[PDB]
Each structure stands twice: as structure tokens, then as C-alpha cells.
């Protein structure tokens, strides 16, 4: 498995450098959280106004995320 993944990673990089040049809060939300880090900070501080649940809100954020 270690060798197989290395071969795939090597193949991925090899294919890279070719197409690129041609084309020239606590929960683990993911990379999208950076696009709403400030919003995610403000929502919690005023968590009394909002009424959704954190699980739903992440689902709502996931659904609306492009």
C-alpha cells in the first residue's frame, strides 16, 4: 500500500507541471471555514439570535457552499 500510493503520487506529480503550464468553530468544518472564519466567529458570539443547530448549520453551510 505504501509503494502503490507512492507510485500514484509520483504519477500525479508527473502529470503535473504539464497541464498547469498549459493553463496559464470547534468542529472540523474543513477548508471552507476560512471563507467564513469571521462569520463563524460572529455567529457563535450571538448564538442566542440564531436558532439552527450546529449540525444543521454545517449541513446548511455545506449545502450552500459552491
Amino acid at each position: 500500500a505504501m509503494l502503490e500510493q507512492q507510485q500514484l503520487e509520483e504519477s500525479e506529480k508527473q502529470l503535473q507541471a504539464e497541464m498547469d503550464k498549459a493553463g496559464s468553530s470547534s468542529a472540523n468544518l474543513g477548508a471552507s471555514s476560512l471563507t467564513l472564519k469571521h462569520l463563524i466567529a460572529r455567529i457563535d458570539q450571538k448564538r442566542e439570535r440564531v436558532r439552527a443547530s450546529d449540525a444543521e448549520l454545517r449541513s446548511l453551510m455545506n449545502e450552500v457552499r459552491k
Binding site: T35, L36, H38, L39, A41, R42, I43, L60, E63, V64, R65, K66
Partner: protein
């Protein structure tokens, strides 16, 4: 000079309290507008083709927009 630096720091200190809240509004708006374009652009096709029942995509986008706003 020592008298003016403190005043500037105080002024800049307050603005940082008003800037942070405005950044959050930007992120909430930049996703709301995207939904607005889809719900807006998902109805023009009905006019273009002149149709029939409302498509599911247009029925499940209004609530998504409404859930986000409310």
C-alpha cells in the same frame, strides 16, 4: 509626539472593532448573492422556453435561500 501617538492608537483601536463585524457581513452576503443569481437565473429559462409545473431545482432553491436569510 508622545501625546499624539496614544490618540492615534486609540482611534485605530476602535476601528478594528468596527472592521471585524463588517468582514463577517461580507462573507454572508457573498453567498447570499450566489443563491440570488441561481434562483433569478433558474426562472428566466421558464420565460425563454415558455414552459408546466415548477422544476424541483426552483422549488428546492427558494427554501434554501429562505433558510439562509431567516
Amino acid at each position: 509626539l508622545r501625546e499624539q501617538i496614544l490618540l492615534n492608537g486609540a482611534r485605530k483601536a476602535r476601528l478594528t472593532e468596527l472592521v471585524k463585524e463588517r468582514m463577517a457581513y461580507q462573507e454572508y452576503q457573498t453567498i447570499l448573492e450566489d443563491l440570488d443569481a441561481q434562483v433569478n437565473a433558474a426562472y428566466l429559462k421558464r420565460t425563454r422556453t415558455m414552459g408546466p409545473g415548477i422544476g424541483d431545482l426552483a422549488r428546492t432553491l427558494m427554501d434554501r435561500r429562505r433558510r439562509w436569510i431567516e
